[PDB]
RNA sequence: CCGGCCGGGAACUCAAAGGAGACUGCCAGUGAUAAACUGGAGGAAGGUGGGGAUGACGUCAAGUCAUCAUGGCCCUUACGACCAGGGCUACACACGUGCUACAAUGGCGCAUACAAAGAGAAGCGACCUCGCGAGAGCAAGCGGACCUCAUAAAGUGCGUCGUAGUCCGGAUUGGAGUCUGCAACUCGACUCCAUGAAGUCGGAAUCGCUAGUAAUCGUGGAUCAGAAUGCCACGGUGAAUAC
């Protein structure tokens, strides 16, 4: 990424909905390269979400995602001596990559039984922003603003 | 690689077949369900180098017991020395 | 006559024979399902029938070997668009824009003396 | 160290092979040793016969052996004479029957190996290493040769501390696979030690 | 523990076992035969087991049987 | 629900609760519920008194528990007594089977210090 | 009736005693099930390159071994004298029987 | 005999030879009307398409007298040579590289689908039969697109476990065995039965990788009687990110 600025390989929008977005989700929650089991876990964590919220599917994940979306971030900047933890504002494009990550990342660090569940319980809690991921954004926020001084 | 170590290996193959493969198959069937009289095994007082596995395997040109290759009969060091003079039929630096 | 295209992907090799009959599909003398309909890529096999309709308009008996689940279904995927050949080049342009035409040439890159596996480098420490 | 051996990297193309027989593993071994036993012996005999190369082929229960030389008559002896007593020992080594060809070497000044040995035997003769390289490179450009280089290694003249010295006159693309390069080695066994010679000779292309 | 089809034992030690069974024991009994399996007919004897530097005295008994002569003759001196 | 050992197991599938005994590991347990006419996965609920003590004998067949322990020490002691390599090994706190001790002998050598 | 295996390490040659043989068949007798390619058993020998230490050096050689089938269905005494006494290429392994 | 199996079929998959093809050449903007870049067309492949091999003059008296060769040096009834047994396998520790885990993206039982690449006569060894098993007896084929090694594993299906030092994890040790080999005490590998440590994801600090890659899953090979968590190869599934 030094000279040859680049684009983006565009993945194959979800084999059960038709969504670029969620197919980034699955990839992100995918591990050791098991796409098979990977979507198995979001489709059945979206299946406990689904009815438990009732608000459809697609658009119910879209709210909990809308929550743990982060508008600004603290970018390092090591100049002579100083770190300079510069706050700054982030692209939409990643703004949900993060959000999806912090969600996947959270539910992995949960105390339930199954990753399907944990995932669901996270989507849910976030929908009503009170989860670990929401908690993340409410620190990426607390940590910008506190170095908001700078600009 | 130290004459005397070769000369051993020659004696090792000599004996390896003067006896074993032959004499030491009065042992092949001998130890299998033909039961019993144990004087059957006891026999093994036959030289020592008489067994095949007592042969190391030496870079036929130099001696090196290490880095041998059966195909060629040499140590990788001579294998490459020949390799680059043709010397080894069909053998070129491959790629894929 | 049997109208057909080969198609392959990543060491897989699938041959696809079209015939205007139904929407029935046989891979390796097997139901679409009975092979991998109900598996990762059950839906990509149909794919080459997106803007080129059927439902039960034309039939395909196909066989494929080498590679695996996704690879094989990749080949097939190719051979259907490649067999949509016969029915003109007035369909083989949105088969383009869809990409099913292209031969995805990604292969597995060899294991190179001095690494763990092609790119994976043995961890190093200065001391 | 870090230059790929110039002959071997060419085998696949533009360069022969000095053994060409087929064998299957089982005998592949015993043949290989036979080969480096006939060249061993031969080179010690036709030592001062300017032999630049000996090719080998076992044509089915048979061994052929050409001897690319630059003094055919000295090898051959009084009408057929020595070629015979070679045949003898060669079949008396390979353990099978031995025919034996004696290809001749024109323009030997162009032959890498014969070149090297020249410089090599001139060092044991005790002649200036500078002068002897300079001669080589010249009579070579002399009779064609789109290029040539020759370096020698260490104790050159005697020095307690050892050097090298090449002499690149002309063209030498050791990166261009088509390039015809006849490359070779020869070591001179002086009284102050052992000096290694390497000559490259750029003949052509395609 | 291997073997399965005939406990092993060198002859030139075994005929040292019978040149003292019939005869009756002498002083110790030197062997370099850490190989052999101890046999019932060695109990009460004192075979000297080479361990590298010298031969270690070892009095046999009614359960040093399925064990190699050399199990009772430490080879690496550690302290 | 004692059976055989001072041990008093249960509250899950029988083939696992059985292994609870010092003397059983999968195989001997499979052999137990099998040779006593029970279904592996059955809890002790439904499993009335009649079935329990039939087992108690099935296990009584082997040298399990306390006796096994006693018998296992018995062995280790035998070794040490004969002053053999594997005995002088048990005594010296290091590993018997042949493993290296230049490093990683820990589980037999015991968490490190000096 | 008679099929001939051909093996030899030189590719630009094996098919040039294949052709030679196929030719000295189609011109005399006839038949011949063309000459068949047949998988090329290629070995590989990867060896350490530095005489001491440096196990990341390594040279990587292969020996390709090529096949040719032939198969002549009609065995004319004449077509069976075409191979005989007209052959050569002292580096191809030729198997006549099966 | 529903086995490409017998005729046959020369189509297709493949097989190994020989050709074609991509050149910033074509459109377009950018740029000095240059180089080039950018984007589009077509195309299997766009901008050195993907990978390998190929490592300039030279730097480190860098490594190798133990692969071999060799100047000098030194031992020669000993610094040589033969045999045995032992040692290189030791063990308060410390560091490097790796393997296996701490688990339900999992363990486990059962059923079931899909590779590549190689090896083989003093060899690979089917089948049958015996044994819980490692294996053993007997015995066909195959110097091998035929025969054997060989029944890919992840995966998918049901089923069970329910967050526990657990049905996770397999160290250590007891006992009993199998094969190789004159010989498995030191010190072989494997197997049955019992055993069930540490370990609940790792301080400071620190390594890899930019795509069919990382991650993860099995397969083979060289050395080799036997002895691979190493080494060299092989496909399966298959990401994240670059202002
Ligand atoms: Mg010597
Ligand atoms: Mg050996
Ligand atoms: Mg791979
Ligand atoms: Mg360690
Ligand atoms: Mg130096
Ligand atoms: Mg140096
Ligand atoms: Mg010398
Ligand atoms: Mg050592
Ligand atoms: Mg377990
Ligand atoms: Mg982990
Ligand atoms: Mg890179």
UniProtKB/Swiss-Prot annotation, chain C:
Record Pfam families: Ribosomal_S9 (PF00380)
Gene assigned in the entry: rpsI
Family of the protein in this entry: Belongs to the universal ribosomal protein uS9 family.
Organism from which the protein derives: Escherichia coli (strain K12)
Function statement: The C-terminal tail plays a role in the affinity of the 30S P site for different tRNAs. Mutations that decrease this affinity are suppressed in the 70S ribosome.
Subunit structure: Part of the 30S ribosomal subunit. Contacts 16S rRNA. Cross-links to the P site tRNA and weakly to the A site tRNA.
Coiled coil regions, renumbered to chain: none
Protein name from the UniProt record: Small ribosomal subunit protein uS9
InterPro entries: Ribosomal_Su5_D2-typ_SF, Ribosomal_uS9, Ribosomal_uS9_bac/plastid, Ribosomal_uS9_CS, Ribsml_uS5_D2-typ_fold_subgr
SUPFAM superfamilies: Ribosomal protein S5 domain 2-like (SSF54211)
Swiss-Prot record, chain D:
SMART domains: KH (SM00322)
Keyword Amino-acid biosynthesis assigned: no
Keyword tags: Ribonucleoprotein, Ribosomal protein, RNA-binding, rRNA-binding
GO biological process, one term: ribosomal small subunit assembly
Domain KH type-2: 38-106
GO function term, MF aspect, one: rRNA binding
GO cellular component, one term: cytoplasm
Pfam families in the record: KH_2, Ribosomal_S3_C
Subunit structure of this chain's protein: Part of the 30S ribosomal subunit. Forms a tight complex with proteins uS10 and uS14. With proteins uS4 and uS5 encircles the mRNA as it enters the ribosome, which may play a role in mRNA helicase processivity. Some nascent polypeptide chains are able to cross-link to this protein in situ. In collided ribosomes contacts ribosome rescue factor SmrB.
UniProt family annotation: Belongs to the universal ribosomal protein uS3 family.
Protein task: Binds the lower part of the 30S subunit head. Binds mRNA in the 70S ribosome, positioning it for translation. Plays a role in mRNA unwinding by the ribosome, possibly by forming part of a processivity clamp.
Name of protein: Small ribosomal subunit protein uS3
Protein's organism: Escherichia coli (strain K12)
Chain's gene name: rpsC
Curated annotation (Swiss-Prot), chain F:
UniProt xrefs under Gene3D superfamilies: 1.10.8.50, 30s ribosomal protein s13, domain 2
Gene Ontology CC entries for this record: cytoplasm; cytosol; cytosolic small ribosomal subunit; small ribosomal subunit
One Pfam match: Ribosomal_S13
SUPFAM superfamilies: S13-like H2TH domain
Assembly, per entry: Part of the 30S ribosomal subunit. Forms a loose heterodimer with protein S19. Cross-links to the P site tRNA and weakly to the A site tRNA. Forms two bridges to the 50S subunit in the 70S ribosome, contacting the 16S rRNA and proteins S19 and L5.
Protein purpose: Located at the top of the head of the 30S subunit, it contacts several helices of the 16S rRNA.
Protein name: Small ribosomal subunit protein uS13
Taxonomic placement: Bacteria, Pseudomonadati, Pseudomonadota, Gammaproteobacteria, Enterobacterales
Swiss-Prot record, chain G:
Matching SUPFAM superfamilies: Ribosomal protein S10
Molecular function (Gene Ontology), one example: transcription antitermination factor activity, RNA binding
Residues annotated as transmembrane: none
Function of the molecule: Involved in the binding of tRNA to the ribosomes. Part of the processive rRNA transcription and antitermination complex (rrnTAC). The complex forms an RNA-chaperone ring around the RNA exit tunnel of RNA polymerase (RNAP). It supports rapid transcription and antitermination of rRNA operons, cotranscriptional rRNA folding, and annealing of distal rRNA regions to allow correct ribosome biogenesis. In complex with NusB is involved in the regulation of ribosomal RNA (rRNA) biosynthesis by transcriptional antitermination.
Subunit structure: Part of the 30S ribosomal subunit. Can also form a heterodimer with the transcription antitermination protein NusB. Binding of S10 to NusB is mutually exclusive with its incorporation into the ribosome. The rRNA transcription and antitermination complex (rrnTAC) consists of RNAP, NusA, NusB, NusE (this protein), NusG, SubB, ribosomal protein S4, DNA and precursor rRNA; S4 is more flexible than other subunits.
Full protein name: Small ribosomal subunit protein uS10
GO biological process per UniProt: cytoplasmic translation; regulation of DNA-templated transcription elongation; ribosome biogenesis; transcription antitermination
Highest taxon of source: Bacteria
Record PANTHER family: 30S RIBOSOMAL PROTEIN S10 FAMILY MEMBER
Gene name in the database record: rpsJ
């Amino acid at each position: 990424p030094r000279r040859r600025v680049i684009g983006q390989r565009k993945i194959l929008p979800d084999p059960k909905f038709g969504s670029e977005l969620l197919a980034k989700f699955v990839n992100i929650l995918m591990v050791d390269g098991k796409k098979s089991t990977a979507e198995s876990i979001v489709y059945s964590a979206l299946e406990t979400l689904a009815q438990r919220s009732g608000k459809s599917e697609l658009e119910a994940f879209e709210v909990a995602l809308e929550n743990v979306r982060p508008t600004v971030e603290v970018k390092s900047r090591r100049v002579g001596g100083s770190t300079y933890q510069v706050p700054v504002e982030v692209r939409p494009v990643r703004r949900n990559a993060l959000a999806m990550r912090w969600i996947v990342e959270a539910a992995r660090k949960r105390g339930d039984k199954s990753m399907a569940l944990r995932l669901a319980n996270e989507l849910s809690d976030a929908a009503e922003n009170k989860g670990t991921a929401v908690k993340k954004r409410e620190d990426v926020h607390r940590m910008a603003e506190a170095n908001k001084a700078f600009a | 690689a130290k004459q005397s170590m070769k000369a051993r290996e020659v004696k090792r193959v000599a004996l390896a077949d003067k006896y074993f493969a032959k004499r030491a198959e009065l042992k092949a069937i001998i130890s299998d369900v033909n039961a019993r009289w144990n004087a059957v095994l006891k026999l093994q007082t036959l030289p020592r180098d008489s067994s095949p596995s007592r042969q190391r395997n030496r870079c036929r040109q130099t001696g090196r017991p290490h880095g041998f290759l059966r195909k060629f009969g040499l140590s990788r060091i001579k294998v490459r020395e020949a390799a680059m003079r043709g010397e080894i039929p069909g053998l070129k630096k491959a790629s894929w | 006559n049997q109208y057909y295209g080969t198609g392959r992907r990543k060491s897989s090799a699938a041959r696809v024979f079209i015939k205007p009959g139904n929407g029935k599909i046989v891979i390796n003398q097997r139901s679409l399902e009975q092979y991998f309909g109900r598996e990762t890529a059950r839906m990509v096999v149909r794919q080459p029938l997106e803007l080129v309709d059927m439902v039960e308009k034309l039939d395909l008996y196909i066989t494929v070997k080498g590679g695996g689940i996704s690879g094989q279904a990749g080949a097939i995927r190719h051979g259907i668009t490649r067999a949509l050949m016969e029915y003109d080049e007035s369909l083989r342009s949105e088969l383009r824009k869809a990409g099913f035409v292209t031969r995805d040439a990604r292969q597995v890159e060899r294991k190179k003396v001095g690494l763990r596996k092609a790119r994976r480098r043995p961890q190093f420490s200065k001391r | 160290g870090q230059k790929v051996h110039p002959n071997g990297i060419r085998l696949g193309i533009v360069k022969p092979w000095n053994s060409t027989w087929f064998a299957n593993t089982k005998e592949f071994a015993d043949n290989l040793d036979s080969d480096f036993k006939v060249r061993q012996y031969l080179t010690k005999e036709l030592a001062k016969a300017s032999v630049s190369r000996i090719v080998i082929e076992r044509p089915a229960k048979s061994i052929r052996v050409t001897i690319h030389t630059a003094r055919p008559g000295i090898v051959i002896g009084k009408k057929g004479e020595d070629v015979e007593k070679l045949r003898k020992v060669v079949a008396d080594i390979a353990g099978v029957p031995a025919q034996i060809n004696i290809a001749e070497v024109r323009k030997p000044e162009l032959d890498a190996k014969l070149v090297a040995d020249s410089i090599t035997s001139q060092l044991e003769r005790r002649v200036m290493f500078r002068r002897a390289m300079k001669r080589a490179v010249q009579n070579a450009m002399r009779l064609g040769a789109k290029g040539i280089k020759v370096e020698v290694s260490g104790r050159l003249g005697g020095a307690e501390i050892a050097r090298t010295e090449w002499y690149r006159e002309g063209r030498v693309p050791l990166h261009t696979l088509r390039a015809d390069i006849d490359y070779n080695t020869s070591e001179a066994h002086t009284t102050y030690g052992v000096i290694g010679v390497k000559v490259w000779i750029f003949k052509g292309e395609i | 523990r291997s073997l399965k089809k005939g406990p092993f034992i060198d002859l030139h030690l075994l005929k040292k076992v019978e040149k003292a069974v019939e005869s009756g024991d002498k002083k110790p009994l030197r062997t370099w035969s850490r190989r052999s399996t101890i046999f019932p007919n060695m109990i009460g004897l004192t075979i000297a087991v080479h361990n590298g530097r010298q031969h270690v005295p070892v009095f046999v008994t009614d359960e040093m049987v399925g064990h190699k002569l050399g199990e009772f003759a430490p080879t690496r001196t550690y302290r | 629900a004692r059976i055989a050992g001072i041990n008093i197991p249960d509250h899950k599938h029988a083939v696992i609760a059985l292994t609870s005994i010092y003397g059983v590991g999968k195989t001997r347990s499979k052999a137990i519920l099998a040779a006593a006419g029970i279904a592996e996965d059955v809890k002790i609920s439904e499993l009335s008194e009649g079935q329990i003590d039939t087992l108690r004998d099935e296990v009584a067949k082997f040298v399990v528990e306390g006796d096994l322990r006693r018998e296992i020490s018995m062995s280790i002691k035998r070794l040490m007594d004969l002053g053999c390599y594997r005995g002088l090994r048990h005594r010296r706190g290091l590993p018997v089977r042949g493993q290296r001790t230049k490093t990683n002998a820990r589980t037999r050598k015991g968490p490190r210090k000096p | 009736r008679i099929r001939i295996r051909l093996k030899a390490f030189d590719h630009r040659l094996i098919d040039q005693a294949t052709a030679e043989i196929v030719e000295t068949a189609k011109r005399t007798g006839a038949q011949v099930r063309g000459p068949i390619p047949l998988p090329t058993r290629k070995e590989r020998f990867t060896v350490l390159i530095s005489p001491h230490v440096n196990k990341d050096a390594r040279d990587q050689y292969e020996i390709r071994t090529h096949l040719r089938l032939v198969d002549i269905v009609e065995p004319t005494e004449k077509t069976v004298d075409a191979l005989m006494r007209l052959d050569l290429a002292a580096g191809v392994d030729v198997q006549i029987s099966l």
